[PDB]
Amino acid sequence: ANDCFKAAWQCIIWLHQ
Amino acid sequence: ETLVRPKPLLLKLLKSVGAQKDTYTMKEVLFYLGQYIMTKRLYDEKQQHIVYCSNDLLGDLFGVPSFSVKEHRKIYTMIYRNLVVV
Amino acid sequence: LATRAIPELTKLLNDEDQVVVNKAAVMVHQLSKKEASRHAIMRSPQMVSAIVRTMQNTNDVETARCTAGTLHNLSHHREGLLAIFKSGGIPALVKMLGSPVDSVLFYAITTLHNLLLHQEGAKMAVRLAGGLQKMVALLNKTNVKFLAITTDCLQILAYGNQESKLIILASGGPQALVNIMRTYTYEKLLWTTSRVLKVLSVCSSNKPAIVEAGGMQALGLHLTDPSQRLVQNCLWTLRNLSDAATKQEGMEGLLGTLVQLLGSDDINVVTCAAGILSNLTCNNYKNKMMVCQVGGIEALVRTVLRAGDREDITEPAICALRHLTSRHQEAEMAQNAVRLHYGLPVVVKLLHPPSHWPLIKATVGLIRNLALCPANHAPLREQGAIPRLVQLLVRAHQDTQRRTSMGGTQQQFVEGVRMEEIVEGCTGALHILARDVHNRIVIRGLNTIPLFVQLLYSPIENIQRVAAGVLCELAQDKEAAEAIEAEGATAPLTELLHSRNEGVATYAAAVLFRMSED
Ligand SMILES: *CC(=O)Nc1ccc(NC(=O)C*)cc1
């Protein structure tokens, strides 16, 4: 209920900019 | 690296989760903002790749009532209008 | 004139009284002054065979000056050199390059210098007599013209003989030859010393030791000296000797000098100037800073404009631009100054023929750096970068797909480009250009998605990095997402999520994030 969100942002932060 | 100084209409968001500085790296802005959506509960816990912000601060900063998690560029550019880079 | 006294003098030098010998050689050097009596001594190998002995076996000074002075008076005449050589003088002259007095060296280092040029065999007998060791040891003399002869003798002996190039290195060579360029002002000596450093550079054994002592920083001092016979030799040295200079400073003035040489009317100078900058910017952080701070972009962009199709000029120039536009503080300006100085249109033209492949390998690598600053997304699409980058990507795949060859698949260089590199760069460049939405309609419209998927099986870990990344930058639009999810991608990506590098466990997981979800 809270993991599929966390693992998504720490992949959008992957790309920086 | 990269440093940006946000516009104060954005700072209210970061100043709500516990931010203390006045300038931030883009890693930090994408961190404090991700903590806001998680704390205030804006995702749709059904399928969680959607963020709601009808009558919230994001709904005023961004401009779109509902944006997806991985639309990248729009998010990247939606955050890039309330800041002034230094 | 007259002889009638040489046999009288032949034994008088061998007199065991070391005082009559001084009173004997006092006139031999005087009687050698005239051209007439000079021929008499040369025709008497019994006479010269005593002068050599009196040199390598004397305790006086006037004897050593009169003897070695006589041998100099013979060097101007032809058959007077063979007598010195057939009397075994070379092992004796090389000795006096040790005894400390200036009057004999101008007489000895010259008698060797003429013997090195105007008589054969000496270039070998000197190396055996240990001449290079005694010659380098006398590089600290306060005289300058004496060093012009000494350094020139080193150029004759070390020319094309890596036995001699290794001897000068072992006996402390480069560290001393730099303190000759860095100090004196005589053009003839600096022309010779630089002429020596070059034939020490091509041997990849002296290349660091010249850099380590301080060769580059000192050779750039004289880049503004008028005599062009000295200028290009210094540039020729650095070009061969910049391979191992990537990790030291002090070049602050050296980089603010080669940039100005790019606007020279001498093509052979710019070629030897951009190649230096191409090697001196491959790994250093602050070297790229200094180039962008002297206006290095505008001056280097203009070079390619007037170079035209001369790839020998554009090949290092594009590589130099690729370095400045990546991974340093002045990045956002280096990628912007190419636009503001009208460099974007010509760079795209280099993608098209008749440009060969090694230059294109560097140009398709420049686009991925030029596309970081988003102000260059529109101009690249306007100049036809997407439909041309796809073309080069198509052949590169439709040429390495010739795995059907001989039992083991022959992979063919010769041209210099490993054809897996063009795929490694083009799909790496499109991964950056596919951020602007208008590109994502062109890249989609060019019917390219069912091609990235076949690349996604390539065992190269740099193909998967960019192929499974350029698809992530296409996965935003649903018009392209659920289309990817049909033409493969559902299964080959399923177990890219356990490959080693954490840059492929992601990306390949970022594509699956949006596809067959809800
Ligand atoms: C349920 C879940 O966590 N899915 C998911 C989302 C994102 C990622 N990471 C990236 O996409 C980079 C993994 C799994």
- CB within 8 Å of C390: residues ≥ 6 apart: C426, C430, C443, C446, C448
| C473 interaction partners in chain B (CB closer than 8 Å) | 72
| C513 interaction partners in chain A (CB closer than 8 Å) | 8, 11
List, in sequence order, every residue forming a beta bridge with B66; answer none if it has no partner. B52
List, in sequence order, every residue forming a beta bridge with C130; answer none if it has no partner. none
- Scanning C32-161, the segments in alpha helix (DSSP H) are 35-42, 45-55, 62-75, 79-86, 90-93, 102-118, 122-128, 131-137, 145-157
List, in sequence order, every residue forming a beta bridge with B50; answer none if it has no partner. B68
C319 CB-side CA count, 13 A: 20
- CB within 8 Å of C270: residues ≥ 6 apart: C261, C262, C264, C303, C307, C313
| Nearest alpha-carbon partner for C200 in C149, C159, C246 | C159
List, in sequence order, every residue forming a beta bridge with C273; answer none if it has no partner. none
In the block, residue with structure tokens 């590169």: C396
**Cβ separation A12–B27 shorter than 8 A:** no
- Scanning C383-436, the segments in alpha helix (DSSP H) are 386-400, 420-433
Q: C354, exposed or middle or buried, with CB in 10 Å at 0-12, 13-18, 19+?
A: exposed
Q: What are phi and psi of B20, to 5 degrees?
A: -130, -30
Alpha carbons C101 and C99: distance in angstroms, whole number: 6
Q: How far apart are the first and last CA of chain A?
A: 28
Alpha carbons C484 and C515: distance in angstroms, whole number: 8
Residue B70 CA: nearest ligand 1 atom is 11
- CB within 8 Å of C18: residues ≥ 6 apart: C58, C59, C60
**For the residues of C4-41, what is the DSSP string, one character each?**
S-HHHHHHHTT-S-TTTTHHHHHHHHHHTSSHHHHHHH
Residue A5 CA: nearest ligand 1 atom is 3
Q: Which helix (H) or strand (E) is B67 found in, with range?
A: strand B66-68
Mutate which: A6, A12, A14, vs B, most B CBs within 10 A:
A12
SS3 C192: helix
Residue C209 DSSP class: H
* Overall size of chain C counted in residues: 518
Residues with CB under 6 A from ligand 1: A 3-4, 7-8, 11, 14; C 506, 509-510, 513
- CB within 8 Å of C146: residues ≥ 6 apart: C102, C105, C106, C109
Calculate the dihedral angle through the C-alpha atoms of C433, C434, C435, C439, rounding to the nearest 10 degrees: 90
Amino acid symbol at B10: L
List, in sequence order, every residue forming a beta bridge with B6; answer none if it has no partner. B83
SS3 C257: helix
| Nearest alpha-carbon partner for C334 in C380, C295, C278, C286 | C295
Alpha carbons C458 and C393: distance in angstroms, whole number: 14
Q: What are phi and psi of C140, to 5 degrees?
A: -100, 15
Assign 3-class secondary structure to C143-155.
Answer: CCHHHHHHHHHHH
Q: What are phi and psi of B24, to 5 degrees?
A: -145, 150
State the distance from the centre of ligand 1 to the C-alpha of B12, rounded, in angstroms: 29
Alpha carbons B22 and C493: distance in angstroms, whole number: 42
| Nearest alpha-carbon partner for C420 in C390, C463, C466, C456 | C463
Query: Do residues B6 and B24 touch, judged by C-beta distance below 8 A?
Result: yes
Query: Do residues C238 and C276 touch, judged by C-beta distance below 8 A?
Result: yes
Alpha carbons B66 and B37: distance in angstroms, whole number: 12
Query: Do residues C336 and C326 touch, judged by C-beta distance below 8 A?
Result: no
Query: Do residues C299 and C259 touch, judged by C-beta distance below 8 A?
Result: yes
Q: Which helix (H) or strand (E) is C177 found in, with range?
A: helix C174-181
Alpha carbons C139 and C437: distance in angstroms, whole number: 67
| Nearest alpha-carbon partner for C429 in C325, C338, C276 | C325
Query: Do residues C311 and C356 touch, judged by C-beta distance below 8 A?
Result: yes
Alpha carbons C69 and C48: distance in angstroms, whole number: 13
Shortest Cα–Cα distance, B63 to chain C (Å): 19
Alpha carbons C179 and C201: distance in angstroms, whole number: 17
Calculate the dihedral angle through the C-alpha atoms of C200, C206, C208, C210, rounding to the nearest 10 degrees: -50
Amino acid symbol at C502: E
**Cβ separation A15–B70 shorter than 8 A:** no
* Overall size of chain B counted in residues: 86
Is C336 within 8 Å of chain A by CB? no
Q: C444, exposed or middle or buried, with CB in 10 Å at 0-12, 13-18, 19+?
A: middle
Residue B5 DSSP class: E
In the block, residue with structure tokens 């400390």: C100
C69: containing domain: 5-517
Q: Encode C167-180: b = buried (16+ Cβ within 10 Å), e = exposed.
A: bbbeeebbebbbeb
Alpha carbons C418 and C361: distance in angstroms, whole number: 10
Alpha carbons C175 and C211: distance in angstroms, whole number: 9
Query: Do residues C21 and C13 touch, judged by C-beta distance below 8 A?
Result: yes
C462 token code pair: 């740099």
**Closest CA in chain B for residue C514:** B70
Alpha carbons C114 and C94: distance in angstroms, whole number: 14
List, in sequence order, every residue forming a beta bridge with B85; answer none if it has no partner. B4
- Helical packing angle, B8-17 and B26-40, nearest 10°: 60
- The per-type count for chain B, helices as H runs and strands as E runs, is 4, 4
Alpha carbons C513 and C244: distance in angstroms, whole number: 46
Q: Encode C273-307: b = buried (16+ Cβ within 10 Å), e = exposed.
A: bbbbbbbbbeebeebbebbbeeebbebbbebbeeb
**Cβ separation C518–B71 shorter than 8 A:** no
List, in sequence order, every residue forming a beta bridge with B5; answer none if it has no partner. B84
Query: Do residues C262 and C299 touch, judged by C-beta distance below 8 A?
Result: yes
| Nearest alpha-carbon partner for C111 in C79, C167, C68, C166 | C68
Alpha carbons B84 and C159: distance in angstroms, whole number: 62
| Nearest alpha-carbon partner for C351 in C393, C300, C412 | C393
- CB within 8 Å of B73: residues ≥ 6 apart: C435, C437, C476
Alpha carbons C83 and C49: distance in angstroms, whole number: 9
The data reach a resolution, in angstroms, of: 3.9
Sign of CA dihedral C331, C333, C336, C340: negative
Q: Which helix (H) or strand (E) is B68 found in, with range?
A: strand B66-68
Residue C468 DSSP class: H
Query: Do residues C79 and C86 touch, judged by C-beta distance below 8 A?
Result: no
Residue C506 DSSP class: T
* Chain centre distance of CA C260: 19
Amino acid symbol at C23: K
Alpha carbons C81 and C89: distance in angstroms, whole number: 10
- CB within 8 Å of C299: residues ≥ 6 apart: C259, C260, C262, C263
- CB within 8 Å of C350: residues ≥ 6 apart: C304, C314, C318, C359, C360, C363
Q: What are phi and psi of C341, to 5 degrees?
A: -100, 20
Q: What are phi and psi of C486, to 5 degrees?
A: -95, -55
Please compute Rg for chain A using Cα positions. 8
C242 token code pair: 């910049």
Sign of CA dihedral B68, B71, B72, B77: negative
User: B3-85 in CATH: which number?
Assistant: 1.10.245.10
Query: Do residues C261 and C223 touch, judged by C-beta distance below 8 A?
Result: yes
C186 token code pair: 């005589």
Residues just before a chain gap in chain A (C–N exceeding 2.5 Å) are none
| A8 interaction partners in chain C (CB closer than 8 Å) | 513
Shortest Cα–Cα distance, C146 to chain B (Å): 56
CB-CB neighbours of C159 under 10 Å: 13
Query: Do residues C115 and C84 touch, judged by C-beta distance below 8 A?
Result: yes
Mutate which: A4, A9, A10, A15, vs B, most B CBs within 10 A:
A9
Q: C85, exposed or middle or buried, with CB in 10 Å at 0-12, 13-18, 19+?
A: middle
Chain A residues with a Cβ under 8 Å from any Cβ in chain B: 1-2, 4-6, 8-9, 11-13, 15-17
Alpha carbons C229 and C225: distance in angstroms, whole number: 10
Alpha carbons C433 and C435: distance in angstroms, whole number: 5
Residue C141 DSSP class: -
CB-CB neighbours of C409 under 10 Å: 10
C281 token code pair: 């910017």
List, in sequence order, every residue forming a beta bridge with B43; answer none if it has no partner. B51
Q: Looking at the 3D structure of chain C, how many domains does it have?
A: 1
Alpha carbons B62 and B77: distance in angstroms, whole number: 9
Pick from C507, C513, C514, C515 the residue to mutate for probing ligand 1's pocket: most ligand atoms within 8 Å of its CB.
Answer: C513
**Cβ separation A14–C509 shorter than 8 A:** no
> What Cα–Cα distance (Å) separates residue B2 from each residue in A10, B5, B86, C301?
18, 10, 8, 27
C65 token code pair: 């000056």
Pick from A2, A5, A11 the residue to mutate for probing ligand 1's pocket: most ligand atoms within 8 Å of its CB.
Answer: A11
Q: Encode C222-253: b = buried (16+ Cβ within 10 Å), e = exposed.
A: bbeeeeeebbebbbbbbbbbbeebeeeeebee
| Nearest alpha-carbon partner for C64 in C100, C117, C88 | C100
Alpha carbons C444 and C458: distance in angstroms, whole number: 21
